[PDB]
Swiss-Prot record, chains A, B:
Record text on cofactor binding: Binds 1 Mn(2+) ion per subunit.
Function as written in the Swiss-Prot or TrEMBL entry: Destroys superoxide anion radicals which are normally produced within the cells and which are toxic to biological systems.
Name of the molecule in the record: Superoxide dismutase [Mn], mitochondrial
Organism: Homo sapiens (Human)
N6-succinyllysine modification, residue list: K45, K52, K99, K107
Taxonomic classification: Eukaryota, Metazoa, Chordata, Craniata, Vertebrata
InterPro entries: Fe/Mn_Superoxide_Dismutase (IPR050265), Mn/Fe_SOD (IPR001189), Mn/Fe_SOD_BS (IPR019833), Mn/Fe_SOD_C (IPR019832), Mn/Fe_SOD_N (IPR019831), Mn/Fe_SOD_N_sf (IPR036324), SOD_C_sf (IPR036314)
Cofactor entry: Mn(2+)
Length: 199, 199
């Protein structure tokens, strides 16, 4: 059992005009494919170092593991966080939590947008669920650093603000990308991750 | 596998008055012991995570692996870098390399002292060997981050400037600790590590 690049659950052009087909095809078939492959390479090196007790080699592999492992985690969620059937607002308990914790849906959007635009360099913005605190929480992550691995928060919605996620279409204007992406958020999927946290 | 705490090459008081017996006993039997015990626990969690393909857990474990793994790496070297028979200046090729790259033994001491005193918070000062350039190099690392694992340099001489390495004796006056430790440097051991990675 090794990790595999999951197929996109929709056509490359399904998110147009918000994210064009060239970005989606490169993002999935080039960037994510590389993370999975590099992740499997790093895991194998880590297994040999562990069997040998080479702690130096284990630590030397950590950046590659976090970057490519994080890449696999984050992009697997990202594809499910988007959909041609997306957009609009969530319903039910997720919507109520958003209003309770952030005041309103629109207030939440400004905060997550500000966190995503506020990333200097490469990184991710996340809406997560804090199991210990029992409420929602917004965080930004550097590079491919994944939310749960580095913060314990359970990822609900991630926004890739790597330049490869938008540059071909929006060039330097990251805020235009952020404006458009709200129209394709698959709140059905985001609701599923939230409801799975509560029991 | 199972890493183990290496026996000290001398008794806890052999480095007095420069490093007192209480520090040595605590440093080896408590601090280093904890790195080994915590390293083994973290490594076991890694094997399970690798067997399960739980990348989040692997990444969540990285800080504990680097801190305790690095702790194990650094302190195992540190003990061999010190000796009751130590002090003075090195001889032969090691001494020649120091004069060439740092001007003189005394200038080398000033630079490594400054790098060690300059660490803000916890960390280590290292004299290392750069295999690609074929010469000596001084660098500082934060916390237990090990020299080779994070820089590729081969460790020759390390100076622990964690507060537990001197505080009981020297309190806040780290420069007195740095000055004193030169008296017990095991240049025979430093030469062995250097010659192993040098003609
Ligand atoms: Mn990406
Ligand atoms: Mn120490």
């Amino acid at each position: 059992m090794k990790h595999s690049l999951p197929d996109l659950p929709y056509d490359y052009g399904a998110l147009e005009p918000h994210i064009n087909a060239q970005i989606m095809q490169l993002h999935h078939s080039k960037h994510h494919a590389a993370y999975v492959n590099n992740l499997n390479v790093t895991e194998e090196k880590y297994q040999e170092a562990l069997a040998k007790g080479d702690v130096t080699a284990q630590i030397a592999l950590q950046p590659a593991l976090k970057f490519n492992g994080g890449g696999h985690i984050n992009h697997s969620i990202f594809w499910t966080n988007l959909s041609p059937n997306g957009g609009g607002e969530p319903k039910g308990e997720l919507l109520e939590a958003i209003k309770r914790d952030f005041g309103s849906f629109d207030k939440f959007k400004e905060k997550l947008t500000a966190a995503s635009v506020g990333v200097q360099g490469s990184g991710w913005g996340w809406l997560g669920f804090n199991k210990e605190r029992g409420h929602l929480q917004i965080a930004a992550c550097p590079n491919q650093d994944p939310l749960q691995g580095t913060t314990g928060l359970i990822p609900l919605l991630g926004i890739d603000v790597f330049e490869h996620a938008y540059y071909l279409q929006y060039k330097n204007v990251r805020p235009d990308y952020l404006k458009a992406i709200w129209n394709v958020i698959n709140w059905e999927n985001v609701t599923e991750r939230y409801m799975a946290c509560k029991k």
